[PDB]
Structures are given as structure tokens and as C-alpha cells.
């Protein structure tokens, strides 16, 4: 299909996720053919801690360059859990060491908190974690 | 108010009132082992004293606690505020000094003075052995000033039995257990304080209990004006009430009413 083999996963051609955006969606989706199919191969034993662990190699790749930001809305359009879960997690890891300044730098966000509100909504957080 | 700031605490059930005054280095929890030996036939009164670790350091007024006298103003203030006409008084060891003064100052108010690890001055004189040689005492100050001048300017003070311990480390060990400025302040009011020309002015009867190996006993036995039993314990130590309390519990019950 356009912006056909093994596109079964999504909630089975539509301009919303256009070619640039949907291109990526195919990369990860047919990489999960290896994950499904390598269970069927090869010899009786295992050989089965490369999906559970080592398949996450290219999961933690493939997310060089957001937006991306619009890939979440594409992974939302197509109701595909394991891809949303993946990119939504990798946005998490951006919001970690970032101070509330550094968050709204690398996520273009308008600081609107009046210092009236702000340090009271802060004093909310001194009632946890200790 | 003073009763709050100085954590006074009354515990047992009885008519006879027992006052338990801790030493300098410690606080009132030094008495926690001994307390229940007497807590069932006595109203036991305890206080933390202003220079102890567990009192706020803000109540240390540095241009007030310059001599032993204001420590005594506190003791008598406490007693008056609880409204105690008479009590027996266990004091160790600067708080023995404080007890002696308070009983000269107010002999109505004490059944008996029981003074653990008492000496009237700790600066051993050319005559005679009542305390520690000034060479040693000097070394103890020499260690606390390091700690004070570490404490500002924000550095860790690390002076403990980095010392010399003639008879001195065990004594001075506990002194370090306060805020270093206050340690130094109350450490000097310990060694400059002499009250051996006040002993024969003591009317109320006194039992000294002394920690183990002419020496001291025979001096203060003759010189105290009250009736003067001097018992000595079996085992050494600054704090017979923490080490060895089952024993000190006995000498205490034996030196009462």
C-alpha cells in the first residue's frame, strides 16, 4: 500500500502518514518479521534470548531524529502497541536529567507558571520521595 | 519554658524525688540503663543540660555560660518550676560540681548529694593528684581548637583519641560529642573551674562514688563539712552508668535515705 506484504499489524493506502513518515513505520514493522519468524527456526534448543534481549539492539536505534515527534501520531493513527511503547519510552529517556529549564528547551514548551503558583506546585513535591 | 528547652522529664511513681543530673559529654539518655532500678520507688527527674548535644545549640548563650554559676541557675530554676521542695541529687561529673554549688546555695532543697566521678578541680597541681597533668590537659585543648577551626571553615573535625590518654582520653572522650564551638567553650569552663575551697562549706550530707584504678578519697573525705562516705567501684570508666550499670545501681540505692 501507499502513503503491501506484512502490514497486518495495525488495527486490518491513506494520506495522513505521508511517505516520509510511513517509510520509517515499515522499517521497524518488517524488522519484527525476524522476531516472529526466528521463533519458528532453527534447531530444537535455544537460541531464545536474542528476541527477549538482543532484538532490542535496533529498537534503541531507529530513533535518531525526532520529529519523529510526528511518528508518535503515526504510530497512534496505526493502532500498533509495541511501536508506540518503544518511541514513547525513548521520549521518556529525554525527559530525565533535564532540569525544568532543560526540558522546555529540548521540548519547545511555553513556561507559564507564575512564581505565585510555581513554588506551591513545587511544595507539592516536597511531600513525596523522602 | 526552661522545662521545655532543657527537656526535663519526670517519670517514676513515688513521693521521694530523685534528681538525675548527667555529665558534660553525654545527655540524659546516659541514665536509661539505671533509671528502672529506682523508677518504681521514686519520682525520678531528669534534664538535658544546655551544653548537651540533644538540646538545641541556639539556647547556648556564649556570653552567659562562661562560669559554672549559670548552669546552677538553670538547675535551681528547673527544680523551682517543677515545684520540688526537697530531692536527693545524683550528679556526674561536672554536674557533681553543679550539685555541690547548688546545695551551698540552697541547702533546704537536698536530702543527700550523691556525686559520681567527682573531683573539685581537674588540673593536677604541684600538690597534689586531684586530676590530670596540665601538659595533658593542654593536649586536649590543642585537639578541640583544631576541631573548632575545622568547624568553621567547613572542614571535617577529626580529633578524638588522636590525643594522649594518661587518665585523660577516657575522661575527654565524651567531650567531643558536642558541636565543636560549644565543646571548646564548655571544655575550658571544666578545667579552669576549681571549687576545693568550697567543700567544707557543704552542709547537706554527701556520698562520693568513684571510678576504679591518699589519692582523692582521703582528701575530700576530711574536707567536705557534711557527712562524707566515699565508695569506689570495681571497674574503671568515665560512665559507670552505661558500662557497668547493674553495679552503679547498687551503690546508688545504698547511698540514699
Amino acid at each position: 500500500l501507499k502513503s503491501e506484504a506484512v502490514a497486518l499489524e495495525s488495527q486490518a493506502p491513506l494520506p495522513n502518514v505521508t511517505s516520509k513518515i510511513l517509510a520509517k513505520v515499515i522499517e521497524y514493522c518488517k524488522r519484527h518479521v525476524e522476531a516472529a519468524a526466528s521463533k519458528a527456526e532453527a534447531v530444537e534448543g535455544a537460541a531464545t534470548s536474542d528476541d527477549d534481549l538482543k532484538a532490542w539492539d535496533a529498537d534503541f536505534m531507529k530513533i535518531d531524529q525526532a520529529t519523529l515527534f510526528e511518528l508518535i501520531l503515526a504510530a497512534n493513527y496505526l493502532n500498533i502497541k509495541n511501536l508506540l511503547d518503544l518511541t514513547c519510552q525513548t521520549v521518556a529517556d529525554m525527559i530525565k536529567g533535564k532540569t525544568p529549564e532543560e526540558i522546555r528547551t529540548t521540548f519547545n514548551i511555553k513556561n507559564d507558571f507564575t512564581p505565585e503558583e510555581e513554588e506551591e506546585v513545587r511544595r507539592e513535591n516536597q511531600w513525596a520521595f523522602e | 519554658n526552661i522545662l521545655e528547652a532543657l527537656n526535663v522529664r519526670v517519670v517514676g511513681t513515688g513521693d521521694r524525688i530523685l534528681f538525675l543530673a548527667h555529665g558534660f559529654g553525654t545527655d540524659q539518655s546516659a541514665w536509661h540503663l539505671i533509671l528502672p532500678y529506682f523508677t518504681q520507688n521514686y519520682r525520678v527527674v531528669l534534664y538535658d543540660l544546655v551544653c548537651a548535644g540533644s538540646v538545641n545549640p541556639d539556647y547556648f548563650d556564649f556570653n552567659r555560660y562562661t562560669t559554672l554559676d549559670p548552669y546552677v541557675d538553670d538547675l535551681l530554676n528547673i527544680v523551682d518550676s517543677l515545684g520540688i521542695q526537697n530531692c536527693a541529687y545524683v550528679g556526674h561529673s561536672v554536674s557533681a560540681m553543679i550539685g555541690i554549688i547548688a546545695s551551698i546555695r540552697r541547702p533546704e532543697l537536698f536530702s543527700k548529694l550523691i556525686l559520681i566521678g567527682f573531683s573539685p578541680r581537674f588540673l593536677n597541681d604541684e600538690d597534689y593528684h586531684g586530676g590530670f597533668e596540665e601538659g595533658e590537659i593542654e593536649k586536649v585543648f590543642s585537639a578541640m581548637e583544631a576541631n573548632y577551626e575545622a568547624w568553621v571553615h567547613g572542614f571535617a573535625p577529626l580529633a578524638v583519641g588522636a590525643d594522649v590518654p594518661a587518665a585523660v582520653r577516657e575522661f575527654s572522650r565524651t567531650l567531643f560529642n558536642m558541636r565543636p564551638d560549644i565543646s571548646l567553650f564548655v571544655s575550658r569552663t571544666v578545667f579552669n573551674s576549681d571549687l576545693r575551697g568550697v567543700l567544707g562549706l557543704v552542709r547537706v550530707p554527701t556520698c562520693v562514688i568513684q571510678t576504679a584504678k591518699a589519692s582523692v578519697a582521703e582528701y575530700l573525705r576530711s574536707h567536705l563539712g557534711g557527712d562524707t562516705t566515699v565508695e569506689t567501684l570495681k571497674t574503671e570508666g568515665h560512665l559507670p552508668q552505661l558500662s557497668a550499670p547493674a553495679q552503679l545501681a547498687q551503690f546508688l540505692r545504698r547511698a540514699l535515705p
Partner: protein, 615 residues
């Protein structure tokens, strides 16, 4: 910038310091949308909420797990009877702030803390954890402590007594006499503060019987043969036959042949087919184990995680004995006098996912078969070799094979993927030599644990200007979580006899590096114990040196101190979480003035702690 599907991004956060920045110290589009659904179900709070809990839109509707056990002051009984509107006023607003709590943890000094907390969450409440290091109230019924839960809270599936001190008889009574509730359980930890000499057979057998549906049971039991009432071959059977739905069973003999034989164990494992996770950890031993271990694989196919105590001859030499057992994800053999180079070699045929091996106190096993294993199993990532392994003494740091990959390491005394390291020093032993010129270089080491045992009173006076080289850990550059546990080091506290020396030396000796670990960010300091008093408390040097760790946000002292020594830590500029956590049985004051500390003091200290400007 999308909406409202940020709550799925936000929910994989998970660090609690980050969720505070974005959002509640940042912009609106998260500072309601985080405090609403995405709170990640967890909040362990700080201050007495029977003081000025004044808030308004402080509501967490998807909050599942709440933790009122670190609530301060730390020991104190929370809203019990020794007026109930003061309690119920607080319980209401705790329900208001967090409804839909499924999982609770509290510090249950007496049962009424429970009768006054639960009935709001009565319907939602699945797991409960009780915490009590203090003496039991000595006059309760004695099913008493557990009663309020089993009667009111009718969805109670899980129960975590791991750190709730009890008599063994409270557990017996409460669990055997609420059949409807007790026969609905699935998870049970009866390690009662590690205080009891274990559960007896007469005690254990009927607890199992009263809980037919149970999947995880974790407990200490009395194993010594010389008793009429040990857990043995029959008792284990009656455990298994009374609740076979067990997937996880962990069973440890406490301490300071015998009555379990392969005969019985085979009959035992035969009754428990669902067994995944199994541990028997005893001092008294099982003799030929091989036949019993085979049966474990034969009868429990799912068996993966297993750790065995004193269990002799698990595996002999060729052919296949403990190795019959296919699926072991993680194995820890614990006390074997018969586990040889040969046996290590072989169980290379258990590299299903041996991701964890461990040898504790197994002497005839050489530094060498070890190389064997890390070779043959090359996805083996945490390991542990310990306290009396005679041949391996940091020669077996110099074992290489898995230094590319081992994610954790434990040992008594590049590495390019060490996350977590755990040392066991003794007495006054030095750190730097036997670790850092042993083998040194760990560019991802974050957490490090140090334990020291014991008896300084019979040590030499660490040569003037000696140290425990905490400073030589400054090399490791993502090392942000420390845990220096001197607790089991006994000493003289405020007054040592003549010739001996007090602990402030030993605290110095130990703590004297930590200024230099600039990566440091979370310290857990257990100070040492004086033979006979049960307050562990800091001395001058300790507070002075800990004060200098300028980059800690969290500091936790498993002991106490007085108010003079408390204020040292306010100097630490961004230090935020600070508590005295006396989590050891028996834990002692305040209704008694037993230690240097007073709650008056710490409640005051805690104001100055979050009345400074902190990031």
C-alpha cells in the same frame, strides 16, 4: 505537543526526581496531566501528615502503591489509639489525596494504626506490607496485629511480613482462624524481622493448610533435628500437599544433617509441579542431593530460579546430576564441601540462561573451573563468590572471561559493563589493596555496597594516618549510589576500657575518603554497633566527613544522632531526602529518652532541611 496521549509517554518515566521537574516545577500541560493519571502509581511521603497537610489539587486518581512507612518521625505509631477524629480526619484526607490504592505499606506499631487506615481503601486493597522493628505491644491478644486486615479488608491477596516483628504465634492464630480470608491468599512473607528462630512444624503445617490457594510463600523455619518440632521430610510434604499452587517457595534456616532427605525431597518436589522459584537455605545439610535434584527437573519442569543452602553433592563429576535441571535462569549453590572443579565444569549444561551463578563458602572449588563456567556459559552476567571460598581470593577477580559483560558482582575480600558491585570486607581490613590494585576500572559502576564485620575490640590500632581507602573509589566516574554498612562491626561506644579504644576512630578509619567521590548522590550509612547498647549513633568525624559529600541529594543513616550533629548536614547544599532509619530489631525511643535523639529535635531539623533553597 500532541494530546491527550502524553500520559502514555509520561507513564514510562520512571525516576521520581524527573516527574517532579516536568511537571510540578515546570509548565501546565504536565503539572496537572502528571499529578493526575501518570504518577506511576508510587508515592512514599515525608512529614507527619497529622501536622499541616494544607493542600488542595493534590489528587492522584490512578495511584496504586502508597508508602506510609517512611512517614516521619520514623518509628512513631501513626494514628492509633495509645481521640479518633484526629486520626479519622487524617485518614480521610489520605484517602482524598490517594484513592484507588491497591497496595499499601505502613509502620504498624499496634493494630489500631490498621483499623484506622484501611476502611477507606477496604474494597480496593490487594497487597499490604507491615513494618515494625520495635517491640510488639506485649499484651495484645495475640492474633491481634493481623486481625484488622483479615476482618475488614476483603480483597486482601498479598501480605509482606518480611520486616514486621511478631511472635510466631500471632501468624499462626491470625492465619488459621479467618478461613474465608486466609483461603483467598496468594502471596505471603513470614520473615518476621529476621528475629525469630524459625517457624516450627506444628506452626507451619496449619498455616499452609489454612491457605490452600497460595502461589508465593517466603519463610524462616526451625530445621535443627534435635527438636521434636523441626521442619523435615513430612512437614515439607504437608506444606506442598496443603498448597500445591506454589510457583515460588523460599525457605531459610536462621542462625547465629539433618532432617530432610532425598527420599522426602523427591516426594516433596513431586507435589509441587508449578514450582518456578525455589530456595532452601540451611546450616544443617542434605547429604546426597543429586537424586533429589534430578527429581526437581523431572517433576518441576518450570523450575528456573533456584538457590540451595547446605546441600551436599549436588553434582559429582561426569555425567549429569544438578544439571538434569535444564531451565535454570539463576543458580546459587551455598555451602557444599563436595562441589568440585569437575561439577562446575559440567553444569555448563545448565547454560539455559544461567545469567546468575553463585558460590558461597565452597572450599575445594578452584579459581579455575570458574574460568570453565564463564567460558562455557557466555551469557552469565551477575556473579557472587563468597565468604569462605578458600581458593578464590581476588585471583578470581583476575579471571577474565566475562569482564566484557557481567552486569553485577559480589565478593568477599577493563570491567566495561559493571553496573553494580558488592564487597564484603572484615574487621579493620583495608579497601584499596584487595580491590583496586586487585583489578580496578569500571566506567559504568553506579551502585556499590560495602559491608564490614566484625569485632574491632580485637583489632590493631590502624597505624597513624591509615585509612579504609574510600578515596580510591574516586576513579569510578558514574558511581553515584553508596551503601557503607559498618553495622556488624562491634566496638566500644562512648567509654572504652583502658588500653582499648572507642568507635570514633573506626568511623574515621572507614568514612575518611567520601569527600572525594564527586559522583556520589545517594548514601546509606549504617554506623557500627557497641557490644551492649542498641543505638548505633554517629561520632564527630563521621558527621564531619559525611557533611563534605557536597553532591548528595539523599542521605540515610541507619542509627541516630543528637541535634548538634544533625545540623552538620544542612551545609550539604542540595541534599533533600534525609532521615534516621533505625530499621533493626529492637528499635528504641521516643516515648522513652533512650538515645541522644529527641523528636522535638528532628522535627525541627526537618524544617531547616526544606526551608533552604534547593534545586
Amino acid at each position: 505537543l500532541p494530546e491527550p496521549l502524553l500520559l502514555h509517554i509520561l507513564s514510562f518515566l520512571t525516576d521520581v526526581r524527573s516527574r517532579h521537574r516536568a511537571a510540578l516545577a515546570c509548565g501546565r500541560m504536565r503539572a496537572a496531566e502528571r499529578a493526575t493519571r501518570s504518577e506511576l502509581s508510587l508515592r512514599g511521603d515525608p512529614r507527619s501528615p497529622g501536622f499541616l497537610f494544607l493542600s488542595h489539587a493534590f489528587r492522584f486518581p490512578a495511584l496504586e502503591h502508597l508508602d506510609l512507612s517512611l512517614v516521619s518521625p520514623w518509628g512513631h505509631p501513626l494514628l492509633s489509639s495509645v481521640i479518633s477524629e484526629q486520626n479519622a480526619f487524617i485518614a480521610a484526607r489520605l484517602a482524598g489525596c490517594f484513592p484507588a490504592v491497591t497496595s499499601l505499606a505502613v509502620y504498624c506499631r499496634d493494630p489500631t494504626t490498621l483499623a484506622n487506615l484501611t476502611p477507606h481503601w477496604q474494597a480496593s486493597l490487594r497487597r499490604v506490607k507491615l513494618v515494625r522493628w520495635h517491640q510488639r505491644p506485649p499484651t495484645l491478644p495475640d492474633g491481634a496485629d493481623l486481625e484488622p486486615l483479615l476482618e475488614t479488608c476483603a480483597a486482601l491477596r498479598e501480605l509482606d511480613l518480611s520486616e514486621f516483628y511478631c511472635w510466631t504465634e500471632d501468624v499462626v492464630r491470625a492465619l488459621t482462624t479467618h478461613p474465608s480470608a486466609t483461603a483467598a491468599l496468594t502471596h505471603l512473607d513470614l520473615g518476621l524481622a529476621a528475629a525469630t528462630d524459625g517457624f516450627k512444624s506444628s506452626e507451619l503445617g496449619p498455616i499452609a493448610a489454612s491457605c490452600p490457594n497460595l502461589r508465593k510463600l517466603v519463610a524462616p523455619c526451625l530445621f535443627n533435628p534435635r527438636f521434636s518440632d523441626c521442619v523435615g521430610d513430612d512437614a515439607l510434604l504437608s506444606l506442598a500437599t496443603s498448597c500445591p499452587r506454589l510457583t515460588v517457595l523460599r525457605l531459610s534456616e536462621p542462625f547465629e544433617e539433618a532432617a530432610i532427605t532425598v527420599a522426602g525431597l523427591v516426594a516433596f518436589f513431586a507435589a509441587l509441579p508449578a514450582l518456578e522459584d525455589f530456595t532452601m537455605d540451611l546450616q544443617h545439610n542434605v547429604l546426597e542431593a543429586a537424586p533429589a535434584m534430578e527429581a526437581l527437573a523431572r517433576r518441576c519442569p518450570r523450575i528456573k530460579f533456584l538457590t540451595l543452602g547446605s546441600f551436599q553433592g549436588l553434582c559429582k563429576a561426569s555425567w549429569l546430576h544438578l544439571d538434569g535441571v535444564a531451565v535454570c535462569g539463576g543458580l546459587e549453590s551455598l555451602y557444599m564441601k563436595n562441589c568440585q572443579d569437575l561439577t562446575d565444569a559440567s553444569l555448563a549444561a545448565i547454560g539455559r540462561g544461567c545469567r546468575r551463578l553463585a558460590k558461597f563458602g565452597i572450599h575445594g572449588c578452584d579459581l579455575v573451573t570458574s574460568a570453565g563456567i564463564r567460558r562455557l556459559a557466555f551469557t552469565l552476567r551477575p556473579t557472587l563468590k563468597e565468604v569462605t571460598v578458600l581458593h578464590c581470593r581476588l585471583l578470581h577477580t583476575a579471571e577474565c572471561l566475562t569482564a566484557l559483560s557481567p552486569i553485577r558482582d559480589r565478593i568477599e575480600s577493563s570491567w566495561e559493563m559493571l553496573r553494580s558491585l558488592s564487597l564484603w570486607f572484615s574487621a579493620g581490613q583495608l579497601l584499596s589493596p584487595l580491590i583496586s590494585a586487585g583489578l580496578d576500572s569500571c566506567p559504568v559502576l553506579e551502585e556499590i555496597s560495602i559491608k564490614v564485620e566484625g569485632d574491632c575490640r580485637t583489632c590493631p590500632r590502624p597505624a597513624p594516618r591509615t585509612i579504609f581507602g574510600l578515596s580510591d573509589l574516586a576513579g569510578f566516574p558514574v558511581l553515584a549510589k553508596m551503601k557503607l554498612d559498618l553495622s556488624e562491626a562491634v566496638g566500644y561506644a562512648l567509654t572504652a576500657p583502658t588500653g582499648q579504644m572507642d568507635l570514633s576512630l573506626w568511623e574515621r578509619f572507614y568514612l575518611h575518603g567520601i569527600e572525594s567521590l564527586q559522583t556520589l548522590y545517594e548514601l546509606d550509612y549504617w554506623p557500627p554497633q557497641d557490644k551492649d547498647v542498641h543505638h548505633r549513633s554517629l561520632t564527630l568525624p563521621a558527621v564531619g566527613l559525611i557533611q563534605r559529600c557536597v553532591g548528595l541529594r539523599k542521605l540515610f543513616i541507619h542509627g541516630t544522632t543528637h541535634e548538634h550533629f544533625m545540623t552538620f548536614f544542612l551545609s550539604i547544599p542540595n541534599l533533600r531526602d534525609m532521615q534516621l532509619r533505625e530499621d533493626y530489631y529492637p528499635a528504641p525511643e521516643n516515648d522513652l529518652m533512650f538515645t541522644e535523639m529527641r523528636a522535638e529535635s528532628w522535627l525541627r531539623f526537618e524544617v531547616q532541611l526544606n526551608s533552604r533553597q534547593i534545586d
